[PDB]
Amino acid sequence: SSVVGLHYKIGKKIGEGSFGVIFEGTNIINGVPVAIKFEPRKTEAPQLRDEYRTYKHLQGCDGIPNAYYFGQEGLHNILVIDLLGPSLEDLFDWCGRRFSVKTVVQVAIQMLTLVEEVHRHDLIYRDIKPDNFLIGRRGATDENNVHLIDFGMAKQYRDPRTKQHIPYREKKSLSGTARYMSINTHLGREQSRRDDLEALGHVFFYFLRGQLPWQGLKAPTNKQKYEKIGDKKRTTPAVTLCDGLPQQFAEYLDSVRSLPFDAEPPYEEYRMLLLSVLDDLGQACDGDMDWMHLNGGRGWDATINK
Numbered sequence: 001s002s003v004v005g006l007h008y009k010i011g012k013k014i015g016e017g018s019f020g021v022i023f024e025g026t027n028i029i030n031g032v033p034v035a036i037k038f039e040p041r042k043t044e045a046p047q048l049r050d051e052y053r054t055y056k057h058l059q060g061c062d063g064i065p066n067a068y069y070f071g072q073e074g075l076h077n078i079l080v081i082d083l084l085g086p087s088l089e090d091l092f093d094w095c096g097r098r099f100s101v102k103t104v105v106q107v108a109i110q111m112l113t114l115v116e117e118v119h120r121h122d123l124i125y126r127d128i129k130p131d132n133f134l135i136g137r138r139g140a141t142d143e144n145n146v147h148l149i150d151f152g153m154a155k156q157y158r159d160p161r162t163k164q165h166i167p168y169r170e171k172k173s174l175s176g177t178a179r180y181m182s183i184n185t186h187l188g189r190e191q192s193r194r195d196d197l198e199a200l201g202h203v204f205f206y207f208l209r210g211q212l213p214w215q216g217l218k219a220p221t222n223k224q225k226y227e228k229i230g231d232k233k234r235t236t237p238a239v240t241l242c243d244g245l246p247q248q249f250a251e252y253l254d255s256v257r258s259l260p261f262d263a264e265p266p267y268e269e270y271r272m273l274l275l276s277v278l279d280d281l282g283q284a285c286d287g288d289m290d291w292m293h294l295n296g297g298r299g300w301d302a303t304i305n306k
């Protein structure tokens with residue numbers, strides 16, 4: 001049958017990899033598009049049912065897509081949420097693998113707000129990457145606003161009732177993307193709120209510079225590759241990363257790297273630190289992004305960009 005979850009008709013496939021078979025969809029009652037995720041029934045790693053619950057907990061938060069359905073049709077588990085636009089990594093490639101300082105600042109304060117709101121709901125993301133931050137669709141009120149998806153790596157870091165932080169431990173497995181993960185993650189330490197923000201700091205320099213100095217490293221295995229990357233992170237000062245860039249980005253990374261394990265980060269202070277960049281450069285925070293000027297002003301399109 002073409003309809004899953006009673007009200008959602010399948011459509012074009014937009015993915016089939018690290019997170020299952022993903023399709024485009026359309027709500028058959030109102031026509032609103034949706035994203036349909038397919039995951040097999042008996043799998044080695046069941047991560048969908050907990051993701052549906054994560055969207056339900058974060059329901060109503062701006063930037064988090066609404067969860068509409070979770071089902072068991074056939075040998076597949078199905079999740080239906082809002083259909084969003086391209087990822088920040090997608091817009092990054094289309095803009096020449098470099099974002100302007102103004103775009104990075106405005107995107108950074110939305111990413112900090114998203115991650116904060118996740119932390120308010122007693123969760124840490126632990127998978128910070130530009131590929132998981134998506135903009136909206138065209139004509140929508142949140143077309144160029146940043147969103148956050150994919151919560152399969154999220155974990156509760158404090159009791160939802162007593163607000164007691166999880167204990168600190170080590171000797172944990174290195175899981176995530178080595179290009180952005182915190183230094184503490186490279187060392188197998190337990191992740192907390194500080195590690196989501198440090199990873200953001202890596203992405204900010206990634207957007208600004210077009211690359212990170214620990215990209216393209218070689219090693220016989222993947223374990224030694226993750227170690228060489230982590231070694232370069234502890235070898236490269238933040239001011240070295242911030243060469244020719246507003247030093248508030250290095251000041252941000254050094255601050256989040258110095259946070260204690262159970263400390264609540266000063267989110268609004270970090271947003272005010274990055275906003276001061278626009279004051280030093282005489283720029284306004286009006287919401288104008290680099291990808292909005294793509295294709296003579298049309299923006300991103302399907303045939304040319306991807």
Ligand SMILES: N#Cc1ccc2c(-c3ccncc3)c(-c3ccc(F)cc3)nn2c1
Pocket residue numbers: 014019022035036037079080081082083084085087131132134149150
């Ligand atoms: N790299 C990468 C990458 C890009 C985009 C993307 C999406 C997505 C979200 C909204 N609209 C369209 C695509 C999802 C996803 C997450 C949960 C869900 F229930 C359905 C889909 N994962 N994901 C991964």
Ligand SMILES: [Cl-]
Pocket residue numbers: none
């Ligand atoms: Cl885990």
Ligand SMILES: [Cl-]
Pocket residue numbers: 179214215216217
């Ligand atoms: Cl790499």
